[PDB]
Design a protein around this ligand. Structure first.
Ligand SMILES: CCOc1c(C)c(O)c2c(O)c3c(CNN4CCN(C)CC4)cc2c1[C@H](O)O/C=C\[C@@H](OC)[C@@H](C)[C@@H](OC(C)=O)[C@@H](C)[C@H](O)[C@@H](C)C(=O)[C@H](C)/C=C/C[C@H](C)C(=O)N3
Ligand SMILES: [Cl-]
Length: 769
């Protein structure tokens, strides 16, 4: 309402965003903002006509010649002098408003220009490690603003200024310096802590870790600005006692995208692990495991064999005193038939689910889903199915370690795994070549797919020569695999069969990159490499001391390997099959909620967790300000990146590889598929924008099962996450494709188009030019 506002006196649509900060900082205890007033939105009150006008947004800026000359009554321009040189008469306040046009109201704030002996910035959360318990201060003499001027860096955990980076701050309006004054702390230790202690308190009133700008003037740090820190990764709400340690699911699952609440909910309801969510992603609490030596030796070493960065990061946590409490003081192998029966039992379970869920709606559906989740867990964690999965893994490790010990050949199980039978994910990638084989002879169909952006393009094929054949080949493929997609573990993400257009570029690539039967030739060649390797290994073993026994046991392990390693990819397939069936049903409930005028769009269910959504259907009431909050949350979560290790203090820890004799400027990673190749690096985040061709090396954030069709043309693979037995890596071996995973910032360090050499045996990358 009024024309002028002081700062204890202060309404975002009245004095704006930072007009407030000062207002809700004057009231805080022990502090005091620089004093002064604020010119209000109700001072802003022809201009409207030009406004309605909305190259052409080039000269319309004539609007800003207007405020400068427009003048605005001295009344409020002397009403303001009714309540010290400045910064932010009236030359300026007005030219400022103008700012909304080049780009509607703006409020101008004017404060005190004290001559600060020292001035700086303060984070109550360490900018580097994001540890909530570590406070950082950047201080420089006089006014220095941010991050440019030579400034001391102070790291104060609590009363202990641990690390001091006293920069040689040489250039402290006057502009020159005194030499001895130059290398002395900006703030005294008493002042540092006082400000630290100051800083560690303001966060309480505001709530969250704050970014506080301060200035020291004749012995007092009083606050000029207090922005909230919005960049930190959220801590999993686990109030359970004390300090805890979390493992990133995204890294092991080869899928680092943020997930929506509904999708998150379903993964949590499936897992037997003590799992939690944070930043739209999933984390496993392994704290209890680390509370005892025999359990934490097991945990650390078991995870280290997946990816060493976990182990190294865990050791960092363990070596961190004052955090983790101190320590007080052969598997069965199923027969041959099991794999075939495990698949059929899974397939039949899916069939029954389809015939059962189809008759469910409303709360009946949600009651049914909860019941079917038990069946998912039975199929997913069948003791026999686990024995099948571990059978392939155990055989790999046995081979890799015994062959290298006997012959010096490293990771031999890679070559022996090549073209392993009954791998649902491998088949999917190769069978897309067959689809392209059907389309290739038809010119009219190709001219269509090469150009169309119609989501319903499959409904327009019937008019084309070869369209019926093309549509048929596409339908069969989608019946087998249209249930996968990038981020498939998120139930809410769009499946291939919901958007077949996302497969077209891959198909077009296959049509031009290969001839009439690449699938057969690739698979058969793999079968040949694998058998030739087997013969060679067994031959070279029989010339060792009592080698015919070594060869005999190696032959057994090889047979187990090729019989079971392919099944490893199938449990997720069966799980993903239920997830999609769940999705279609939930979508039908969402549409029903829209018809009832309860939801605005049926996809808004994605931002509700299962139990929350279940209550909405039951009660008929939603809180949209929660949904809208979730939508804002998910948006910020996409801008985040999950750390490999997250602590209860919010500290993000990524492991470090131990470089021994590996090339100087080489980029270290985890070797998961043997071989050395040179090729053009292709940095790609979206598979449908991958213009892959012969000689290319795929560099991406992650390769979950859906990425497999992009493997058929590339000569190497580089990812930022993943592990030894995770998705992607297991497919690289069977495709005979050299691969290095767990490469930190690979999509940033490696420039698209660069020639690189990767070593899938030693695990490194070399930039060639
Ligand atoms: C210490 C690691 O902690 C985890 C982490 C980080 C996870 O992400 C775990 C995880 O995603 C799952 C699971 C489901 N497995 N559970 C837990 C262990 N049980 C013996 C069997 C059922 C566990 C995750 C864990 C877990 O707490 O940590 C311990 C072992 C896992 O990490 C090495 C192993 C068992 C891993 O496989 C390996 C390398 O041996 C798990 C994930 C699993 O066996 C792999 C082979 C898998 O693909 C299963 C079939 C996935 C089922 C999907 C379902 C939704 C699920 O809950 N999976
Ligand atoms: Cl189109």
């Amino acid at each position: 309402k009024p024309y002028v506002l002081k700062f204890q006196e202060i309404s975002e649509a009245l004095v704006g965003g930072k007009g407030m900060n000062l207002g809700a900082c004057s009231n805080i205890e022990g502090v005091h903002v620089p004093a002064g007033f604020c010119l209000t939105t109700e001072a802003y009150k022809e201009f409207t006509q030009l406004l309605q006008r909305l190259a052409i947004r080039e000269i319309s800026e004539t609007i800003r010649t207007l405020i400068q000359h427009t003048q605005i009554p001295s009344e409020i321009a002397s009403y303001m002098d009714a309540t010290m040189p400045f910064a932010v008469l009236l030359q300026h306040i007005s030219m400022c408003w103008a700012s909304l046009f080049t780009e509607v109201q703006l409020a101008v704030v004017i404060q005190q220009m004290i001559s600060p002996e020292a001035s700086g910035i303060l984070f109550t959360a360490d900018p580097i490690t994001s540890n909530r318990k570590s406070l950082s201060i950047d201080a420089s003499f006089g006014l220095g603003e941010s991050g440019l001027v030579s400034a001391d860096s102070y790291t104060v955990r609590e009363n202990t200024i641990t690390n001091k980076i006293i920069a040689t701050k040489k250039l402290a309006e006057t502009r020159i310096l005194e030499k001895s004054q130059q290398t002395k702390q900006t703030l005294t230790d008493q002042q540092i802590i006082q400000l630290a202690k100051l800083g560690r308190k303001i966060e309480a009133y505001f709530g969250k870790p704050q970014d506080i700008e301060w200035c020291l003037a004749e012995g007092a740090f009083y606050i000029v600005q207090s922005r909230p820190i919005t960049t930190l990764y959220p801590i999993p709400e686990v109030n359970e006692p004390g300090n805890r340690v979390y493992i990133s699911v995204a890294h092991q699952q080869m899928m680092t995208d943020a997930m929506k609440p509904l999708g998150l909910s379903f993964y949590l309801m499936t897992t037997p692990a003590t799992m939690y969510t944070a930043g739209g992603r999933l984390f496993v609490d392994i704290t209890q495991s680390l509370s005892a030596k025999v359990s934490r030796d097991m945990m650390v070493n078991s995870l280290g064999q997946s990816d060493p960065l976990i182990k190294d990061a865990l050791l960092t946590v363990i070596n961190k005193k004052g955090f983790l409490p101190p320590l007080p003081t052969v598997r069965s192998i199923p027969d041959s038939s099991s794999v075939f029966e495990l698949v059929r039992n899974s397939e039949n379970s899916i069939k029954h689910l389809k015939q059962s869920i189809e008759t469910k709606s409303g709360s009946d559906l949600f009651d049914f889903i909860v019941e079917d989740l038990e069946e998912l867990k039975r199929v997913l964690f069948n003791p026999t199915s686990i024995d099948a999965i571990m059978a392939g893994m155990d055989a790999s490790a046995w081979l890799n370690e015994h062959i290298y010990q006997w012959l010096g050949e490293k990771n031999v199980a890679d070559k022996l795994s090549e073209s392993a039978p009954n791998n649902i994910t491998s088949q999917m990638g190769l069978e897309l070549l067959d689809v392209a084989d059907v389309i290739r002879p038809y010119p009219a169909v190709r001219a269509y797919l090469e150009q169309t952006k119609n989501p319903d393009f499959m409904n327009e094929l019937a008019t084309l020569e070869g369209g019926a054949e093309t549509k048929k080949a596409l339908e069969d493929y989608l019946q087998k695999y249209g249930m996968r997609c990038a981020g498939e573990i998120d139930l809410t993400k769009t499946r291939w069969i919901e958007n077949p257009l996302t497969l077209i570029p891959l198909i077009l690539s296959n049509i031009k990159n290969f001839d009439s039967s690449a699938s057969m030739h690739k698979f058969a060649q793999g079968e040949k490499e694998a058998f030739h390797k087997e013969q060679e290994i067994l031959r070279r073993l029989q010339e060792l001391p009592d080698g015919e026994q070594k060869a005999m046991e190696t032959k057994e392990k090889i047979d187990i390997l090729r019989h079971f390693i392919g099944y490893r990819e199938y449990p997720k397939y069966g799980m993903i099959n239920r997830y999609f069936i769940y999705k279609l049903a939930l979508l039908r409930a969402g549409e029903q909620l829209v018809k009832d005028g309860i939801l605005q769009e049926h996809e808004d269910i994605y931002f509700l967790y299962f139990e929350e959504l279940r209550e909405v259907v039951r009660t008929g009431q939603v809180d949209y300000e929660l949904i809208n909050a979730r939508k804002r949350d998910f948006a910020t979560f996409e801008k985040l990146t999950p750390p490999r290790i997250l602590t209860s203090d919010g500290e993000m820890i990524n492991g470090e590889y131990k470089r021994e004799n590996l090339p100087k400027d080489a980029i270290l990673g985890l070797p998961v598929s043997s071989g050395t190749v040179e090729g053009r690096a292709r940095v790609i985040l979206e598979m449908e924008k991958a213009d892959l061709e012969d000689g290319d090396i795929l560099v991406t954030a992650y390769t979950d099962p859906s990425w497999t069709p992009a493997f058929v043309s590339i000569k190497g693979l580089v990812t930022e996450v993943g592990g030894l037995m995770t998705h992607g890596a297991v497919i690289a071996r069977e495709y005979g494709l050299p691969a290095v995973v767990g490469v930190e910032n690979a999509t940033t360090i490696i420039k698209d188009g660069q020639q690189i050499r990767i070593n899938g045996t030693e695990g490194y990358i070399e930039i060639l030019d």
